[PDB]
Amino acid sequence: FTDYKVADITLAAWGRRELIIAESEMPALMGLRRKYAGQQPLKGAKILGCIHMTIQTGVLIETLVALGAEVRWSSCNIFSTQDQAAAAIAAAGIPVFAWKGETEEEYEWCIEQTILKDGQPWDANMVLDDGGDLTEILHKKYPQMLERIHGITEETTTGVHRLLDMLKNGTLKVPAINVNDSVTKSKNDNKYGCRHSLNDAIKRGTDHLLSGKQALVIGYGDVGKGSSQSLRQEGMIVKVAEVDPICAMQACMDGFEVVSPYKNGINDGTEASIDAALLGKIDLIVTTTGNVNVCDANMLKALKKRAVVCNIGHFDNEIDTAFMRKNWAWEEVKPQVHKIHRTGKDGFDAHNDDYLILLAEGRLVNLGNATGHPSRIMDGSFANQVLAQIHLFEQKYADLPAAEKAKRLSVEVLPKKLDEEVALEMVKGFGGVVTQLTPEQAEYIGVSVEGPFKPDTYRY
Amino acid sequence: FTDYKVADITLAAWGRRELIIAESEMPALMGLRRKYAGQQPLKGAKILGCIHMTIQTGVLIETLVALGAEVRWSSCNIFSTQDQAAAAIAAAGIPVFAWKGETEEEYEWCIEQTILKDGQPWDANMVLDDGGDLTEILHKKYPQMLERIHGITEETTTGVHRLLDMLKNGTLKVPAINVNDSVTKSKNDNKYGCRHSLNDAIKRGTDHLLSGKQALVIGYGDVGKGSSQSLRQEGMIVKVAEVDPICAMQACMDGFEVVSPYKNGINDGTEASIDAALLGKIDLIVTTTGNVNVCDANMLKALKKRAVVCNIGHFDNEIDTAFMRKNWAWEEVKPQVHKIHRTGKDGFDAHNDDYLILLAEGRLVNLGNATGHPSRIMDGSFANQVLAQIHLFEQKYADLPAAEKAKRLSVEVLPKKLDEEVALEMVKGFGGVVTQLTPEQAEYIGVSVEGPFKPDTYRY
Amino acid sequence: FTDYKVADITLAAWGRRELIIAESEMPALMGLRRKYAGQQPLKGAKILGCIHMTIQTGVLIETLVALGAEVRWSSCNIFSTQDQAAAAIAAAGIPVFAWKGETEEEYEWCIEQTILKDGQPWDANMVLDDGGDLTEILHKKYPQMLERIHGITEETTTGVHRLLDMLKNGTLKVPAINVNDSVTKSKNDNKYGCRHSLNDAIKRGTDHLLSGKQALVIGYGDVGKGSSQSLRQEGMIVKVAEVDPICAMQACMDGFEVVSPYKNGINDGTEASIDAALLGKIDLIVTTTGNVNVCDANMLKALKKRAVVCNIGHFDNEIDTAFMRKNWAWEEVKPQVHKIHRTGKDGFDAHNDDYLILLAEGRLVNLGNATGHPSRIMDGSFANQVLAQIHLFEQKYADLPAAEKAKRLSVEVLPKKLDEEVALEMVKGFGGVVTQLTPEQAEYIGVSVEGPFKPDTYRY
Amino acid sequence: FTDYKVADITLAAWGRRELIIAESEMPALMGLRRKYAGQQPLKGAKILGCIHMTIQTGVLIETLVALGAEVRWSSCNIFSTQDQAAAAIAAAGIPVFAWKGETEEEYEWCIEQTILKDGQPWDANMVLDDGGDLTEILHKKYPQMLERIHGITEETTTGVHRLLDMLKNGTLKVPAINVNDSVTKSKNDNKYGCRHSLNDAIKRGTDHLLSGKQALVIGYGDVGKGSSQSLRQEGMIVKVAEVDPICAMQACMDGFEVVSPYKNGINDGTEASIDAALLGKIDLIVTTTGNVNVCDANMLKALKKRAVVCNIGHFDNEIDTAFMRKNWAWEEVKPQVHKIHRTGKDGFDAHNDDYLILLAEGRLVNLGNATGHPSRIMDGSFANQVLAQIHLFEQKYADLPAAEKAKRLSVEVLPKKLDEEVALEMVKGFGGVVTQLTPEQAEYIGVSVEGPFKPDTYRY
Numbered sequence A, B, C, D: 001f002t003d004y005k006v007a008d009i010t011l012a013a014w015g016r017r018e019l020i021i022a023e024s025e026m027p028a029l030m031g032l033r034r035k036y037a038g039q040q041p042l043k044g045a046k047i048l049g050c051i052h053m054t055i056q057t058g059v060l061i062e063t064l065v066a067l068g069a070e071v072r073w074s075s076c077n078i079f080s081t082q083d084q085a086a087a088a089i090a091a092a093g094i095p096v097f098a099w100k101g102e103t104e105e106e107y108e109w110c111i112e113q114t115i116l117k118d119g120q121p122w123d124a125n126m127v128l129d130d131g132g133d134l135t136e137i138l139h140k141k142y143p144q145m146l147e148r149i150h151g152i153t154e155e156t157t158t159g160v161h162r163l164l165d166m167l168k169n170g171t172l173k174v175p176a177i178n179v180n181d182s183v184t185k186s187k188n189d190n191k192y193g194c195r196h197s198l199n200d201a202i203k204r205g206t207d208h209l210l211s212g213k214q215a216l217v218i219g220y221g222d223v224g225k226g227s228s229q230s231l232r233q234e235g236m237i238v239k240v241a242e243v244d245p246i247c248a249m250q251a252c253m254d255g256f257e258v259v260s261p262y263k264n265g266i267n268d269g270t271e272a273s274i275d276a277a278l279l280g281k282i283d284l285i286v287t288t289t290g291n292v293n294v295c296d297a298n299m300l301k302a303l304k305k306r307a308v309v310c311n312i313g314h315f316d317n318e319i320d321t322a323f324m325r326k327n328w329a330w331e332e333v334k335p336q337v338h339k340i341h342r343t344g345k346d347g348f349d350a351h352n353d354d355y356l357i358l359l360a361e362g363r364l365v366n367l368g369n370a371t372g373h374p375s376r377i378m379d380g381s382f383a384n385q386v387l388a389q390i391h392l393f394e395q396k397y398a399d400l401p402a403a404e405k406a407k408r409l410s411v412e413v414l415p416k417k418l419d420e421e422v423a424l425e426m427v428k429g430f431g432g433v434v435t436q437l438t439p440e441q442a443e444y445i446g447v448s449v450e451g452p453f454k455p456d457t458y459r460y
């Protein structure tokens, strides 16, 4: 077996030890493996996967394989691979093209190695994506391959936005499931995973005390809520920026001061518009938005000396790293930790006081400087991914006639009953005990004893 | 002016001082007062109101009056009235029938004084309700009055369930707005209001240290989330019960142990099914469900000696108080605090060790033993109520032809843009500054610079 | 029985109900009652007591009486009495001169009624004091009575400072025990009691949401630590001022921003020295210092409109209330809540926006606007008070010859073994289980299996 | 230069980058460097140092060198060295014998390389020690070298106990400073350092979600307080064991359940004495005691399957690792992470469910699996170490006559004024501003405007 590319195949035994521990932390996902093993619901499935090649993704891959799938795998970020996970999957005879510290060229080459087998399009029929890079490449460069693909299961908020844009423009060629918007994904992974992994990544990259220090979190969606808690629980003094007044109201009620980097919130492109007093007091800035240039050049110029800058949103463009690359000298501390010298770019003084510390070159910090979300949280996301793969593979959209395709070409979420069954396995993994409604109580609140327990309008 | 009934009209000046303070804590609601004063959008409105007669409800009433409405008011709970608020509203010439410590008979007589003026149905044309008692009485006993009513605005989760039941059975006679499911209501009032007011009510009723003690919260919806935080932030060791595995998963991730009062979560009706060891360690139980008999007789028999029992869901039936009234002696400590002697009901021993403390006789504890939610939280709920009253009054359903009525007979929520505008006034009240998107950024995430910023599917 | 003065003797049954509940919350103090009942160690003791006449003080009084003492009692603050507690003690035939809302003249008259019986010095032989007012009056006005007094047991940090000043000046006439510096007092009452009771008092006085709002706590000793936590756990954004850099370092490490009301911390008596930007953002200021004028006139002029001002240190002088009384109009909201109108003092405009809210006229806010510390916390302080009364009464200093007096004239703390026995009863009251050292382990760390477990230098 | 032994000298540039960052996080220590550089107070000092060879210890070493000292250095733990810190110090021409993952034999050889230069006792005259191993070796094996040594500065609680034992037995040969009991050490490092570094080490070793899981912390001294907070802030359900009822009372008031591993707290030596139900629910145990066998064989047999076991007290003996090595198979996951298979010791099944995870082989987990405490915390400890080295070196005990020695042979702490000056530089490093007392205020509380601000009896 040679159909792979990883950093070091000799890490496979370490990877396999970690996979065995992870299996014990992922009861929803291992429950699906155990339930659906007999039935082989993914027999015949040929899955192109593009998602962070971590130990958790390993347990997802081997679940899909155990249910009958074949896969070809790549990471959706240049720094998110755990090399021992990539090695364990390669050593199991699974095609994977992933290492930590890819270049942009190696990243694209790795996605192309999943799409192509022996130099020709693989007989793919399913797509599992995180952030939409693989989905975009298939639509733009391999439209013939999409004729035989039954669906896309999309992990993250940014990738779902890209799918919905394609659906509105009539360019989406196969149906998708929005896995992000299961409650056991969005209100589990996006929030609690960032609570666990943001402070973890800053401590591994810098070993900085956080207690006592001033943080600014840009955004207060699911990731900004979990990020703000990651920092506040360590004793940081956390300020929150938002454009959405409903998310800002939650931040105030959660005990955060809501501030804007710009005077009166107005970003009119000038240095004069920067709240220099506020940014001059900030020791850490974290972007959580999925948006573009929310930590801009003028903010970076105004930050306190030796402030840490990082991004936990899907793509680097949240921070104006291109400005920093043009203007300022980069001194590498160790991989995924750079001192950015604001003195200029004509080399640097090792003793200069005027620098920022950038983590993961502005790429997803939790995965770049630590290991991303823990197994027990990713259990929820990846149980949903498996149920979504089963649903779209069983629906066989590619085999429908043209007029039947038209009725099914949609971006859909999984039913609440499945979201509840995932949650129940998660709860039992903590040793939680869920109460069973009496018939009197089920009748009183108007639900089945078996659920679903809430209307689809319920926000949790 | 004599068209009122309150405890003590001489409390009116104290009530008016508190209303003036509350106005300064309710910028969304006082913003609507200022915006809509010129236009008099509620000129001709005749509103039957049934909601806790607090200082916050006072500011809501005088906002509706300032926009042109006439009202007739009662409380929706026997113990929720603040007698100084009732007095200040009566002293202003507004018809209100409310006092703290009504009997069930006085509670019904107070609703009937709103419905009847000078012994004849009032010419009502709008309904503002909290929990659905007024709505039920109009549908069952005054169907002719609903012919002239343009709509119902319903405050709370339990009242919305009752409206939806009426809509499914085709017994609902007028359209309604679900005010509960604005984000600036459900994920503000229901959660953060209970965070503020639950520990406040237990302290006023008992003056018990909570730190170090064991609590069981039954439910982890919006109210159980806020209630569990109210107790945990004071240092209680909080356990959470749930029937909904998604809410139970959130409890686990929020750092609570999830337990059932029943062995393996199965209530078989018998004493054998009670987890006696768990209930024997609990010092406080709080029901938050909107359901029936979630703290049942067998649980009450098993609780630790001198445990506190209370309910913060809409109706008393959450706790089996009827069992306690049939079997056990009630020793009143002071109003809304009773020792329930488990020795029997043939008088009591003042020195008996074997009792429970019941707050507010099992009625809403935050309103019964304290003052409910604070003005700055109720600002959001009541800004929504005013917007909902304007919308249904302007729509004039009662004046539509039969065939036009059929298209409008619905239970609806307010548009997200209004929810956003309420939240923005709340944020500015904290001194928060919301960032304005650049045109580049608005285009990047596919929203207007003005909002709405989220899809209607977004759960916050 | 007529040898008392209280607000309303008809509250005695309510007071007695609360005392019976408090006994169940005070196991250390009720354990002493049970242990020492046979021995009557305080037979012959005649105790002048001056400490807040709360339900908790009631349980202390009746413990001293049960161990054989007679007492004459007054409160050490004009607003700290709970009238039902004072009534229950009077109705038990115990001399008490206390009500909530005394004037300064009534406060002094009440202490004088304890000192004098039937117009002549009582045959006092022991003193229990909180803050040193009674101790000062005996030294200055009744030196003959001190000839027959065996000791003083002093509750609080401010009173201990006054005793040590008298000891250094050679004016202290009888030995004292510093009850404040038991760990089961200072690191229990001073810290955790203020955590419980500060947010309790602000919510009863104002019903203000605290979440989201800016607080400034002046001080970070035991009371400032508990106060800062009281506010931070509700979601306040808390800033801390300190003069002691070691306490300030703890505040930084506990996740607070450390600020000064004065530019660069320099209080040079000018308006120019005030950090107007900082004070203009503060919604609540709490003084915790035991010092003088730490919230001064220039700070009060600079505070944000409608800010709440309160003191939880022993005496009112922490806030410059005398400035406010000279310059500004006081509008009473309700007892112990005043709007202070910064427009001037020639009456007030009920609708003026430019006011501060002062709680308890600047007197101890927890006791003034709520009920002070909870029974289960005061258990520790008052178990120490009883052990200190036993120790100094048994030592019989008044009966020593002049030369034996000289060797015993000291301010001492209770032994660590007694502090540990109090703590153990407190722990068992939570249902805590303390591990017993093996002989091997006791030998390894160099302690007895029975304790004491720490050297006297240990800070906990 | 060859007078060193490290893992990899090529890590020196990475070490030096991290030392330059650490200097910016250690203002008290770099303030002393700047203040005392002119004076060279340690000119002629020859310091044997034995303390964890981290980046923080690097900044301490180069401060001592900058003040004029020569040093010979080793780590006080086999797994605590950061090999880049060791390399940077060796590359600077400083003798250091340290690497991560020493054997017990290499650990002793490294201490011996400090004591011996070119095969003969070095002309040492000062000792800096953490835990007392170096101190014991000098007293037992190199008594002649102690004739020329002026003093010992001891970092940690366990080492101070060993010094005091030597002083009581009259075997201590040179005076010592207890650096541990500065407030800016004991109530900074021991508590907040463990808050930072315990959850950091468990995450790096296991990547386990902690939220939702059950922890037992054995001990609630400074380390158990910080450890319990490390776990609780991540959402663990934390139970605390203690032998000291005062520390147990603080645990209860801090909102922890206090439990014993043994029924009624009595370890009878037998399996029957184990609370099997409690230990069967624990997912993580952390020892923090400085004591022996506080997580014993019977507890290890009773723990829940797949529980994590770790120690953050000075020495491995807290956990019965000798029992585990005799009975059970050790499967190495990666360095400092072992699965301990409770099936027996005759090899292991890679898929066995019945194991415990042991971190750092039961040695200090924060240093063994992460990087120990952060620079900004160790700033305080190591500013004290430098002040202590200056004081004992200037006192020149070895040069005193026999009779002068007898008056100085003591274990002392640093003066409070120095503890204050360290804390003030720490506070200014957070951007904190300490208020200056007015003369009025200084007189009122009886202190100098310059401090000290507290009596030596004050516990903070």
Ligand SMILES: NC(=O)c1ccc[n+]([C@@H]2O[C@H](COP(=O)([O-])OP(=O)(O)OC[C@H]3O[C@@H](n4cnc5c(N)ncnc54)[C@H](O)[C@@H]3O)[C@@H](O)[C@H]2O)c1
Residues within 6 Å of the ligand: A156, A157, A158, A159, A189, A190, A193, A194, A218, A219, A220, A221, A222, A223, A224, A241, A242, A243, A244, A247, A288, A289, A290, A291, A294, A312, A313, A314, A315, A364, A365, A366, A367, A372, A373, B435, B437, B441, B453
């Ligand atoms: N690193 C991880 O492990 C991880 C986990 C899940 C999601 N993600 C990614 O994180 C991003 C956020 O995901 P989410 O689920 O929180 O999305 P979301 O839509 O819930 O939250 C994004 C928030 O950013 C706010 N925002 C937008 N522009 C802003 C601006 N200029 N200033 C301030 N706030 C602004 C929005 O109003 C919104 O509330 C996405 O790119 C998503 O794919 C990463």
Ligand SMILES: NC(=O)c1ccc[n+]([C@@H]2O[C@H](COP(=O)([O-])OP(=O)(O)OC[C@H]3O[C@@H](n4cnc5c(N)ncnc54)[C@H](O)[C@@H]3O)[C@@H](O)[C@H]2O)c1
Residues within 6 Å of the ligand: A435, A437, A441, A453, B156, B157, B158, B159, B189, B190, B193, B194, B218, B219, B220, B221, B222, B223, B224, B241, B242, B243, B244, B247, B288, B289, B290, B291, B294, B312, B313, B314, B315, B364, B365, B366, B367, B372, B373
């Ligand atoms: N006191 C107040 O001020 C206040 C404020 C808002 C709402 N309410 C009332 O509180 C109640 C709850 O409102 P909500 O918004 O939280 O509703 P919700 O539907 O969000 O939450 C109720 C929760 O109870 C759970 N539950 C139902 N039966 C249960 C059982 N037997 N055991 C355990 N859990 C069970 C459900 O699964 C659900 O998650 C309603 O009656 C509502 O009208 C009171």
Ligand SMILES: NC(=O)c1ccc[n+]([C@@H]2O[C@H](COP(=O)([O-])OP(=O)(O)OC[C@H]3O[C@@H](n4cnc5c(N)ncnc54)[C@H](O)[C@@H]3O)[C@@H](O)[C@H]2O)c1
Residues within 6 Å of the ligand: C156, C157, C158, C159, C189, C190, C193, C194, C218, C219, C220, C221, C222, C223, C224, C241, C242, C243, C244, C247, C288, C289, C290, C291, C294, C312, C313, C314, C315, C364, C365, C366, C367, C372, C373, D435, D437, D441, D453
């Ligand atoms: N209300 C209550 O129930 C209660 C409880 C216990 C104690 N007390 C009283 O509270 C006060 C404080 O007691 P404590 O035990 O916390 O004393 P403490 O000595 O532990 O703390 C007082 C703190 O105030 C600081 N301080 C002094 N002047 C200051 C200034 N100008 N600005 C900022 N900080 C300043 C000191 O440095 C010190 O750390 C005393 O008067 C005590 O008697 C009241």
Ligand SMILES: NC(=O)c1ccc[n+]([C@@H]2O[C@H](COP(=O)([O-])OP(=O)(O)OC[C@H]3O[C@@H](n4cnc5c(N)ncnc54)[C@H](O)[C@@H]3O)[C@@H](O)[C@H]2O)c1
Residues within 6 Å of the ligand: C435, C437, C441, C453, D156, D157, D158, D159, D189, D190, D193, D194, D218, D219, D220, D221, D222, D223, D224, D241, D242, D243, D244, D247, D288, D289, D290, D291, D294, D312, D313, D314, D315, D364, D365, D366, D367, D372, D373
């Ligand atoms: N890992 C680190 O970075 C670090 C930092 C500082 C100190 N330390 C070490 O940690 C240890 C503890 O230091 P400390 O400052 O907390 O000491 P401490 O004396 O403050 O606390 C130890 C606690 O253990 C308790 N205890 C003793 N035997 C027990 C038993 N059988 N069960 C339960 N509790 C028991 C004691 O009552 C005491 O309160 C020492 O060995 C010290 O040298 C480690």
Ligand SMILES: Nc1ncnc2c1ncn2[C@@H]1O[C@H](CO)[C@@H](O)[C@H]1O
Residues within 6 Å of the ligand: B051, B052, B054, B055, B056, B057, B076, B130, B131, B155, B156, B157, B189, B193, B314, B367, B371, B372, B373, B374, B378, B381
């Ligand atoms: N202070 C208050 N004033 C009026 N209504 C309140 C108050 N506190 C809570 N409520 C309302 O009580 C309703 C339940 O009957 C909740 O939906 C909440 O909106």
Ligand SMILES: [K+]
Residues within 6 Å of the ligand: A054, A056, A371, A372, A373, A374, A375, D207
């Ligand atoms: K991970």
Ligand SMILES: [K+]
Residues within 6 Å of the ligand: B054, B056, B371, B372, B373, B374, B375, C207
């Ligand atoms: K209220």
Ligand SMILES: [K+]
Residues within 6 Å of the ligand: B207, C054, C056, C371, C372, C373, C374, C375
């Ligand atoms: K009290």
Ligand SMILES: [K+]
Residues within 6 Å of the ligand: A207, D054, D056, D371, D372, D373, D374, D375
């Ligand atoms: K470190």
